[PDB]
């Protein structure tokens, strides 16, 4: 649910940037690179504040290797927010690797 405001990626578990709300400047995003695994949005969406470099598909993939599993076998990325590179992000059951300047 793209309920989160707009600035840096904030990641939050409480539609609203609220619940475990967290920060991502594309910068913490360089630590894990792509999120290269599966992004839910139930509880667990974010703002995006900069390109986020969205490669999603359905997930499909729990037999990963030890976590670094990319959850799916991407359907089509939607880099800047999936229209405008500065907004709250969705996502819902659905994987993505997300990418903050990685």
């Known amino acids: 649910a793209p309920s989160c405001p707009a600035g840096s990626l904030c ?19 360089e630590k894990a690179g792509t999120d290269g695994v599966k992004l839910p949005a139930s509880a667990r969406s974010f703002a995006n504040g900069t390109h986020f470099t969205l490669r999603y598909g359905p997930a499909r ?11 799916y076998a991407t359907v ?27």
């Open 11 to 29: 990641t939050y578990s409480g539609t609203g940037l609220s619940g475990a709300r967290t920060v991502i400047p594309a910068s913490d995003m």
């Open 61 to 71: 993939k729990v037999t990963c290797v030890r976590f670094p599993c990319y959850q």
């Open 76 to 102: 089509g990325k939607v880099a800047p927010g999936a229209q405008l590179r500065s907004l709250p992000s969705p996502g819902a059951t659905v994987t993505v690797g997300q990418d903050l300047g990685d």
